[PDB]
Design a binder for this molecule. Structure first.
Ligand SMILES: COc1ccc(-c2csc(NC(=O)[C@H]3CCCCN3S(=O)(=O)c3ccc(C)cc3)n2)cc1
Ligand SMILES: COc1ccc(-c2csc(NC(=O)[C@H]3CCCCN3S(=O)(=O)c3ccc(C)cc3)n2)cc1
Ligand SMILES: [K+]
Ligand SMILES: [K+]
Ligand SMILES: [K+]
Ligand SMILES: [K+]
Lengths: 144, 348, 348, 144, 348, 348, 144, 144
């Protein structure tokens, strides 16, 4: 994990930008606005609440490492994603429509680029009366 | 292939009235077969019952067997049940095991019995056992188990305490009344086993009256016991009632709020965006308009956004409370006063 | 014609004390006639009872018949009861059917009986049946049915589960004790019917004591049963109590809030405005001061306003909750900060 | 229903005023202020929440059609209107006073023009000691 | 004269431990005298009991009589009890009537009995009756009556319904089993009175077992009855428990909030100010610094202020709820946005 | 020395499964030894039981004695238990007294009995008494005592009232039925003691049926009694259930909020700062950068800050309520409008 | 009551000041500021909520008359005043201290003029160890 | 206690600064800002709520004396402090780590000066595997 913590120290330096070792709300909003994103204050606050375990209001480097250390291919995260799909499932059979999914992605929540959706649909076998098994997507994007 | 899902939801997730009429009918058939089995015990009516329980039995086995095969074929409308292995997973769950056992054992007993009294000795239990077939989704059982689990400490507590009081008071009564003879000349409290029996049947407010204390010591102790201990064998009723009620009510009030839908959308979208991050030549990289170190920071932000969405959705799955109000009022007032100061500076 | 409504509300929607004194008196008369019927059963007092139940009967039939006719005439104060057909609708409801049946059957039995033991065999049931006459509006019954409907799942659940436990444990006891002979030499658990009887009278905490298990197996099973199953036949008490309480309390707390009145006004007003929209030459068109396409858009807006008022009023019919607080705080804070930005721009 | 959807597409064009196919809060407030009405922001918001079923915050044309499609002469709307009258009914007999009704219309809620009320009263048989059966009005304005 | 109030609060509004030790002691004395009266019934111990109940009786009458006189003199610390008429009002309340009756009747019975078996026949009831003496302020009874009054509709409802079910099911059982003979040869259900007896003792889950149904019809009806009707004689427990709890808890949570004190101050102050208004030459007129019409308007404003304070205080006497939150948020946000517009105009 | 704390938390504060498996095993051993003691009473099995209760007894005493010594040594991981006096304080608490009594008395009885029937007469009670050993922290008992204390008024109330009703109704029944003879020729209600017995066993819904009233007066009174008084001996169930539930639920919901941590930090920090204040040459005086009177004011401010932190933390230890919302909304809106006025002045 | 309604119409004219017949919040705040009082907006709002029974937000003349018509010497108002005193009563004996009462009047709630309190104290027999029976004040100021 | 009340009158004069005898929020914030502290308004409000028992909003001299009179070495305050430590105790054995305590003091709550913490740690026997018994600190700072 020495190369891992090397890359994580590198990545943490990009947010730190000085010898503090802590990340402020402003200290993150600047980095994001460099990317042309324009987040809200409360958004950065919510991002930063779910990293720190001290409650002080910034991200220490061990907290950063704790974030990076835990895994997306998780027993619980799989269930969360699977249960998120079911909100949009008619009849709950484990299948959803192509056009319906395209509509949900491009309109609801953080709206996607159309070409991103064009990539998304073709990852799975979409044929067979237009239906698609979403557990396939789950296993895919939980494969890491 | 809509026929498949159609019959599925007709059999497994029923709604309407035609579905309900069907399931109610099947319930009546099984109850009726049971009560014939009840009448098989009465010597006055073991004649008719044993005979008519031969025709009905074969009718029901062909019925439920045909029904099970249709059901198992129709299950493929689901996604985790398609495939032979999917079916084999569908038969793995409890209620299907129950149905299979009932039908198969019915076949065994009917084929051995025609060419056999132990048969009917088994039939009665199978008739009793078929009642599990009614709940098609185990909603009752799941509800009970949930509510029991939530209140496990209270129930263990009252069980422990009432147990102790039973043990100690029944020992004291035994000491008091091992000599006491009934009016009929027999000794009720011969042994501590019988005192425990009396204690159980007393503390829980049944009172058959087959064992009674005679001596003033026993009556004193029984009074204090019956007045101060019975209430521990009656807590579970109130606890379980409150739990059932609240459980159901939250489960149906959550049928209304719709922020779950945007939060779910957001969750799925950021999850797949994060997955698109790893592959270097993903198309999604065009959203920002060259990538010296941008890989890292983008992965960091998207990772965080994912866990943020995860928790927001999770918290959206639950009802509201005062904590929400307090926290959001704080946040809003603070952001406000920040902007107030910003403008108060703008005046300069 | 205020006499009509006056006697109506004296008879149907009573308030005050004079009304209450009257209804209480009538209750005493019917209870007293009942208890004479009770004493008609006792051979010591079938002499007086049968005789005095001839005078009282004719007194009561003339009383309640006169009362019913007065009532049916007075019903015309309402609006859906005016007209012969209105009256015929008024007699269609249940309690009036009850009153009519009682009086008419009283006339039949008294006219056949004077010139007849089956008579009194009917009289006792009619005396029993008149008690329905007390609740003038079925408030008790409506309350019960409401609260039962709300909690239908919980009750079906506990009924199902306690039923199963009864069936299975009683079968096991039957197997354990079909041979057991009582001290008096008779066999209590002859049949599964009797074990079911024992189970019902046990699980519900009555315990007549006419059937008792003798063998250690039966006592063990009865202990576990009586300790773990009884609480399912006692949930309904707590559930129904909570439901009655909450139902009544909300129904009387809603006697206070007054935003219902503006919301109702708004609803009626926009509804009739929408209806005025269709007719082209309505006068209401002058409110806007020529109508190239204005017809459409005006109908659209008024239609929407109607459904808005509909839902606002509907939601005003219900008590308050945390959702209201959260949503309105959000909306207010957002509108605020919007205006903050607007002014922050005005400084430029 | 081809002429019906023709008229509804026509009517939707008046709110759209461009090739969006969605109606914004501003996009409706402009039309209303052309009529000299001056609604509040939250009012337009409430109007627009009760049209859309997507939750996004605008009115798609199918949502517009869904609004237009459902009927006022309804089993439930009749009961709602009837139960709205009863708030103002003394003794609940199904009758209300002429002057009382005139007072309620011209003062409470969205106050009416007096001549509109003069039209309203004469729609029903007002004679007979000044009382009026309001179920008549219900059946009338639910006749469509 | 602090001695007076001191002994009063020692006797009437006790706190601490010395007070509590005293009252507990007196309770023990009265319980002990009771249980001697209990033992006066047992022929084995009517010897000692009748004798020792002569000394104790005179001891207690001198005790409680001295105590009553001290009490009645000490009551003058209050303000509505000073004066002979105040005392006569103090003896008018119930518990003092009880104490007086007990002591006086004790004197009568002891003076007639010494020079008489009806005496002791009265003594037992007086000993039983003295227990009322314990609650010095009727807090238990007041609590019960309050909570019962609040939930009067629910209790009348369940009483009515369970009553009807009892009447009808017991009649049906009577018809079913007027011929049924017990194993001992006697007929349990001779009359409808006995069926009512059985019904009462069944529906309420006691089950002495002295009356049992024999015929399949009776058992069927008794099962349905006992399963579906018992829960109406058990609601009151849950209702009353919730009521007691909530009542007490609110009554002790209101020991904390202090806005009652300013609101009370305000109320008294504006009330007396209003009263000062009427007299023309009051000094309070100088607060405004000639009175052409000012009399009227000042009276109007002060009158309103009084009723405002009245209602504010009244509402302050009660706990909090969501209505407060909603209304105050509305008012604050509105006043805010008004000021926002005012400033937005100030920029011009 | 981590071994010490490790075995401590294995024995005293268990978690996981291995701990749980151990404690469950020990429970099974003690239950099993009990039920052998149960079978020591039955003359059929006093042969084996008395013999096998000699080996098991010595096994258990060496087990629990070794266990106690290990435990008492391991207690030193705590801070108030280090030192001989710490240990002597550890043995002072109840459950350790229980364990010591059991083991020591076991040694005494086994050493006297081998070279003795009173022995086993003691053994049975010790086996009964060992069950206290299960709850390692008295959580059940502490919970019960807490919830009982909170609801002391309600319970005293219902106890008092049901007591009175019992006394009075039972006296009335005694008067009614002191002459009534049973079918078997004996008189059930000989004395008021027996009527009290009947009353206790009735009012609490047991109903052995050994005493029954015969005369119409007694049945009338018993009906009214059983219908209107039983509900006071059943309140405690509902009260205690609600209390247990709410207690546990708050105790586990408080496992989440984290403002306790900053508030605790603040408290400790200001406390020690205040203590640093007294010593003149403390280093902390440098925080302000000569001390003419600054000593006083600094002590004043720090003192206040301490009590402020104290109360803030204390209030943070409790769940949320509407009071918080109301007060904080008021404060925020007021501070807001103050700043609004400040800026409205800045425009000049 | 013709002179009574005459005086009440007179008094209502002073608040109306025009031919409206309704009293607005401003319309009352002006009258009060003429007296040099300076009430808060919410104060006038609270004053005016407890007069009107229509909920519209102003005082019709019949509402004004309803206010004037009901009496202060009331079965309930007596109890309210009596129960208000008891907040300040130590030991609840029906007596309070002279100095305590003077302190409460001049400091808490709407603070009184000292001479008004000097009038208040001397209305009742204050002697007798300085205690005073407040039910006397109750009967006095409820005598009207 | 005559010298005690002498010193308390002296100390109260520093806050009073005039012949009022009451302390306002401003009247305290000025004194504190003379020390270069800059408290928030709500902070002074909270400070002043927990001194006065009249509810008026200022500190009378008897209230000041009541504050000074009650003692820190209290049966309840001891328990509060002891229970405050336990939030930071792993395994609840009555010991905490040196470095952990140093971290908590310098970061959480009102952050301390490092040298103050250096004083704090050395007050107690810190040796013995770095653990420290915090009940010692409790008895110390509750000795007064
Ligand atoms: C009618 O008014 C009432 C009636 C009851 C209560 C009430 C509160 S707590 C309570 N019992 C109890 O708290 C427990 C514990 C204390 C003794 C009484 N029971 S024990 O017999 O199970 C029992 C007996 C012996 C042993 C070794 C363990 C357990 N009884 C309060 C008011
Ligand atoms: C089925 O529907 C029902 C059933 C019951 C109720 C209900 C509310 S309060 C209540 N009893 C009671 O309030 C008390 C007090 C009034 C008489 C009845 N019980 S007493 O016998 O204990 C009793 C009897 C005699 C004495 C000297 C003291 C105590 N009973 C309400 C509805
Ligand atoms: K029972
Ligand atoms: K029984
Ligand atoms: K029973
Ligand atoms: K029995």
């Amino acid at each position: 994990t020495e190369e891992q913590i090397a890359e994580f120290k590198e990545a943490f330096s990009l947010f730190d930008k000085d010898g503090d070792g802590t990340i402020t709300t402003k200290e993150l909003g600047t980095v994001m606005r460099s990317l042309g994103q324009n987040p809200t204050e409360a958004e950065l606050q919510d991002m930063i609440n779910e990293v720190d375990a001290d409650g002080n209001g910034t991200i220490d480097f061990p907290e950063f490492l704790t974030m990076m250390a835990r895994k997306m291919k998780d027993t619980d995260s799989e269930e969360e994603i699977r249960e998120a799909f079911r909100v949009f499932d008619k009849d709950g059979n484990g299948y959803i429509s192509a056009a319906e999914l395209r509509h949900v992605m491009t309109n609801l929540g953080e709206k996607l680029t159309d070409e991103e959706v064009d990539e998304m649909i073709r990852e799975a076998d979409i044929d067979g009366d237009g239906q698609v098994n979403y557990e396939e997507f789950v296993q895919m994007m939980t494969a890491k | 292939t809509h026929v498949q899902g159609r019959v599925y939801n007709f059999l497994e997730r029923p709604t309407g009235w035609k579905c309900f009429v069907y399931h109610f009918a099947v319930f009546l058939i099984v109850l009726v077969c049971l009560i014939f089995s009840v009448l098989s015990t009465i010597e006055q009516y073991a004649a008719l019952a044993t005979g008519t329980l031969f025709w009905m039995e074969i009718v029901l086995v062909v019925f439920f067997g045909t029904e099970y095969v249709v059901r198992l074929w129709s299950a493929g409308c689901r996604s985790k049940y398609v495939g032979l292995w999917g079916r084999l997973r569908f038969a793995r769950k409890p209620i299907s095991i129950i149905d299979l056992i009932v039908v198969v054992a019915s076949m065994v007993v009917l084929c051995v019995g025609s060419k056999a009294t132990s048969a009917i000795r088994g039939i009665r239990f199978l008739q009793i056992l078929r009642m599990l077939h009614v709940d098609r989704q185990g909603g009752t059982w799941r509800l009970l188990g949930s509510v029991v689990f939530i209140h496990r400490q209270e129930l263990i507590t009252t069980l422990y305490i009432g147990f102790l009081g039973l043990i100690f008071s029944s020992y004291f009564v035994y000491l008091a009344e091992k000599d006491a003879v009934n009016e009929s000349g027999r000794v009720e409290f011969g042994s501590y086993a019988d005192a425990l029996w009396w204690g159980v049947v007393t503390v829980t407010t049944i009172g058959y009256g087959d064992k009674v204390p005679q001596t003033w010591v026993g009556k004193t102790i029984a009074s204090c016991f019956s007045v101060f201990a019975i209430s521990f064998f009656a807590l579970p009723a109130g606890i379980l009632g409150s739990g059932f009620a609240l459980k159901v009510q939250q489960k149906q009030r959550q049928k209304h709020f719709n922020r779950q839908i945007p939060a779910a959308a957001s969750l799925i979208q950021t999850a797949w965006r994060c997955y698109a991050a790893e592959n270097p030549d993903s198309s999604t990289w065009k959203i920002y308009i060259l990538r010296e170190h941008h890989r890292a920071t983008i992965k960091v932000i998207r990772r965080m956004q994912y866990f943020v969405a995860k928790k927001k959705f999770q918290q959206a799955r639950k009802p509201y409370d005062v904590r929400d109000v307090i926290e959001q009022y704080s946040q809003g007032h603070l952001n406000l006063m920040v902007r107030i100061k910003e403008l108060q500076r703008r005046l300069d």
